[PDB]
Structures are given as C-alpha cells and as structure tokens.
Amino acid sequence: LGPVKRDGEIVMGVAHIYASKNDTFVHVTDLSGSETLARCTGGIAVRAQRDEATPYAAMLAAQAVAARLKELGVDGVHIKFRGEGGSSRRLPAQGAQSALRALARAGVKIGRIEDVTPLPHDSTRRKGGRRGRRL
RNA sequence: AAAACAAGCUCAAUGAGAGCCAUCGGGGGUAGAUCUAUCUCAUGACGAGUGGUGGAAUACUUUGACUCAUGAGAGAG
C-alpha cells in the first residue's frame, strides 16, 4: 500500500546501482530522497564474500527488489550508475549491467540511465604509494 | 691674443650592448574568488551487514553504521 494512484497514471522512482568490486547496491528511492526497499549482494544477496560482487548475485538482489516494487507498487525506476569514489577514479563493475537487466525482465519499466560516478578534479592521493600495489 | 696641420677620433662584422615597434609564453611573485572530490559534524529516510582479498581475518556495525538526500565547516589539489 502506498501510491493512491489517480486512475490511469504512472509512478516513477530511482535505482542508485552502486557497483563496486566486492559488492552491489540496488538502493531504490524517491526522487526527493525518501528511501524505499534497497537490498544488496552482501545482505540478502548471498553468503561467502567470494561471490558478493558476482553478476548472478547482483541479478538475484535485483529480482528481490522488483518483487517488492510491483507490490508497493511503483512502476518504473530511473537508473543512475555509481561506480566508486574520487581518489580511485573507478567506474562501475560488471555486476551493474546484470542488475539493470534483471529489473528489465522482472519486469519493471525504466528510462533515463545515467553515470553519476563522483570523479574529482585532480584532488587527493590514492592508496599504496609511489610503487602502489604489487601482488 | 692671432695663426697652421684637408688638424684628427676608420668600418657598422650572419661580434656585442642599448633603444624603439607589434606580437608571444603553464618565466617568477602577491591577493582574492572558482570548481568538483575526500573527510568530519548536524538533521531526515531505511533496517543487517559494510569493508577488504588469490582466499580470509583484524576492523566499523541495530547506543543504527553502509548506501540515499539536503545543509554547514575544514585543509589539500
């Protein structure tokens, strides 16, 4: 129970797919900023830690949200892609594009996909150092 | 005082210096704005993990972190 729909109207929301190595987030919310059901690979998504970020486990979490959305029930959610933060400069993982596609074939209506990765303008030092990571 | 020596001190170097003219450039200094990013703090939303890895653990978490939204501050770039 929620929308109190007018009759022949469409209700829209947001996705916020934060895709980063080690985890995936499908934290859907209203445009204003009131959070609806979220979920993620780590929580209800799986187990292990091995397979948090892997694109099956993102695909499982993105059905678990869209179970609820029809129920709430929204309709379609705008998708914004967040990769990772500024110092690292990392763009979204593979687990994004499986999470998006599970919402489509759930199925939930969509539109306006954006990359909202916080990139810096120069700014700060990375981890590691001069030589950086060497493994 | 009045003479004479054509009295005399070369050239204007793809040597050099100085001058003048219209440009050019992340040359240097001082002062103030600007742009995202990161961190902190305050408020709201949610409700079990988040992090991190070849794989894990130490670590922070319902005295509500992690993500999402607004607002203020800081120092560096």
Side-chain angles (χ1 to χ4, degrees), chain A residues 39-103:
Chain A
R39 314 305 294 177
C40 35
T41 169
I44 172 184
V46 191
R47 254 164 55 180
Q49 304 155 304
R50 190 72 177 76
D51 299 303
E52 274 164 26
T54 54
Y56 171 65
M59 185 178 72
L60 210 166
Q63 283 161 37
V65 71
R68 175 164 195 83
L69 265 47
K70 295 175 188 180
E71 179 228 53
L72 212 51
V74 174
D75 217 40
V77 296
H78 299 279
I79 300 179
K80 301 175 71 73
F81 277 80
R82 168 161 166 69
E84 225 247 54
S87 189
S88 302
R89 311 178 140 284
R90 282 205 279 284
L91 314 188
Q94 72 200 319
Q97 300 165 312
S98 197
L100 178 139
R101 198 188 60 192
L103 287 170

